[PDB]
Amino acid sequence: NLYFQGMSKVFVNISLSLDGFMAPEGMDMAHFSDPTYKNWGAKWGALMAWALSQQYLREKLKLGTGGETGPVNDMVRHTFERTGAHIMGKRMFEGGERGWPEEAPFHTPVYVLTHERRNPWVRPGGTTFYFVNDGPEQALALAREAAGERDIRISGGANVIQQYLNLGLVDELEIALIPVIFGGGRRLFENLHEPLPQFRIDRVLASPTATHLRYVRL
Amino acid sequence: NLYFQGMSKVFVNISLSLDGFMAPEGMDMAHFSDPTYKNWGAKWGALMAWALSQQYLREKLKLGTGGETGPVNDMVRHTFERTGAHIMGKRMFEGGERGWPEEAPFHTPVYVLTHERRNPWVRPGGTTFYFVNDGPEQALALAREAAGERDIRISGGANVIQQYLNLGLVDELEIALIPVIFGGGRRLFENLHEPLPQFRIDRVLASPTATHLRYVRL
Ligand SMILES: NC(=O)C1=CN([C@@H]2O[C@H](COP(=O)(O)OP(=O)(O)OC[C@H]3O[C@@H](n4cnc5c(N)ncnc54)[C@H](OP(=O)(O)O)[C@@H]3O)[C@@H](O)[C@H]2O)C=CC1
Ligand SMILES: NC(=O)C1=CN([C@@H]2O[C@H](COP(=O)(O)OP(=O)(O)OC[C@H]3O[C@@H](n4cnc5c(N)ncnc54)[C@H](OP(=O)(O)O)[C@@H]3O)[C@@H](O)[C@H]2O)C=CC1
Ligand SMILES: [Cl-]
Ligand SMILES: [Cl-]
């Protein structure tokens, strides 16, 4: 595609356990209010700790003050600022419906892939959730239209990312690889079929608690 | 353990696809002589390419002349030189029985975990394979006795590494993370149970075709 560089990029940016899980076993709606179940809360906390320690996110999410202010924080600023639309699945959405503040932390249109017929959900702070029932290509078409000159983030979870991977639609795959082993949960790289996606390493940013890997489609 | 630094370290050093596989589907003895089956040979090649292009290994394995000569090369040299004994499983052994040169590339005692009651197999160049039938703790006891002041490498494959992980016996875990997606095969991080291994990141060495990760036990 000769004009690729002028097009909005479709990217994934996630935190992954060393063993390849995006969520620990027991992190489901049934146990959402009991984080001691299979110690899921502690595993989740270990996974996200790097991010929640970045000054920029701490400010943006109103978590508190202080935080780290290096290359990783600048990276996290760019991921937020570059995004014009988000795409996610229903399990991620259900978790957030209960765990996000009223001012949802997207501030863009968000396209939720679900079989449920549901009207859009407006949140203060410039987030509207749209419930898309006709699949990932249509969600992406809507998202590209909404994103303008900015990029499209496939937020997650794994089931939705797998579909975009299988469709050949992920331009950039960014992974914070964390030195925690979950032993179970939602495996990112599962249910992939041929032709499989192909990537090269574009950049690595090492840090004491996470290795930040950036892959771009071949 | 106050004396830990005087004891041989038990380490894993492997190449891993981005999706967490140590071997592609199809790489079995029935298809060992048919590398086009499920494209397994090309996938295996992609996984090991970074190491076979290093000067030190090209010379040691008599693959050919020349090669890369920076930090990655120095790293591979240290991995060979540090090792006083190897532990492996039987599927790895079988592949090697057919694919290693007569002068096997270990040059130390090698303890092969297997149900087969079998006499040792001596190879030119200082390698002897011993077939251990009473489990990974005994193989490690024998390997430690063999290793002297040098380290003990758990060569692989995934099944044997999983046992040592689950036993809490892996001191160091070194992974060349390769930007290839296999979509199946022998998953490294599978069959793990609590209490799960706990690691910290010790070092990352980035290269254009592989990201070299080193984890040490907490
Ligand atoms: N580690 C990280 O960086 C992050 C982790 N997460 C975690 O990911 C987990 C959720 O991931 P996962 O379980 O894979 O679920 P997803 O969030 O991917 O949701 C999958 C569900 O969305 C709906 N759906 C997906 N695709 C379609 C489609 N094409 N048509 C209709 N419905 C569709 C279906 O539910 P339905 O049939 O009910 O509509 C499906 O079961 C959570 O635990 C969350 O915390 C999330 C983001 C980042
Ligand atoms: N990517 C990489 O860096 C590397 C990849 N590899 C690859 O790994 C693959 C092999 O891995 P995998 O399939 O997991 O097999 P393993 O090499 O781990 O061998 C497993 C077999 O060893 C025997 N065994 C293991 N543990 C015991 C035990 N406690 N007691 C008795 N027997 C035992 C069993 O065979 P039995 O019952 O017949 O005795 C078992 O099926 C190969 O394709 C090889 O090329 C290997 C090394 C490095
Ligand atoms: Cl639903
Ligand atoms: Cl719809």
Side-chain angles (χ1 to χ4, degrees), chain B residues 23 70 129 153 166:
Chain B
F129 296 94
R153 188 166 179 185
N166 283 328

Side-chain angles (χ1 to χ4, degrees), chain B residues 2-64:
Chain B
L2 280 157
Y3 312 121
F4 175 76
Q5 295 188 63
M7 305 184 305
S8 300
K9 303 309 168 304
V10 179
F11 78 100
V12 173
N13 183 295
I14 57 81
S15 296
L16 197 66
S17 69
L18 181 51
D19 56 342
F21 293 99
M22 280 180 56
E25 184 180 346
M27 189 184 181
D28 62 14
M29 291 314 294
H31 302 91
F32 210 61
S33 70
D34 187 9
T36 72
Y37 180 72
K38 298 182 173 169
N39 202 32
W40 84 253
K43 291 162 75 163
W44 177 252
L47 199 64
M48 290 311 163
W50 70 272
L52 302 186
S53 67
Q54 302 308 306
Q55 171 283 321
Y56 182 88
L57 286 181
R58 292 173 60 77
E59 195 283 340
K60 185 62 55 170
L61 296 173
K62 291 171 200 186
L63 297 188

Side-chain angles (χ1 to χ4, degrees), chain B residues 75-128:
Chain B
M75 183 188 71
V76 302
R77 177 169 66 253
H78 171 66
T79 303
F80 176 95
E81 290 184 343
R82 70 184 293 197
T83 304
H86 294 81
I87 299 172
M88 65 177 54
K90 192 66 168 300
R91 298 293 85 74
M92 180 179 191
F93 173 78
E94 291 163 352
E97 188 176 28
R98 181 68 61 76
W100 295 318
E102 184 190 28
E103 177 169 0
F106 302 94
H107 310 287
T108 69
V110 174
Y111 295 91
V112 180
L113 288 167
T114 186
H115 294 101
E116 189 189 5
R117 298 198 324 286
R118 184 165 171 173
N119 293 331
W121 185 37
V122 175
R123 316 303 306 119
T127 306
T128 301

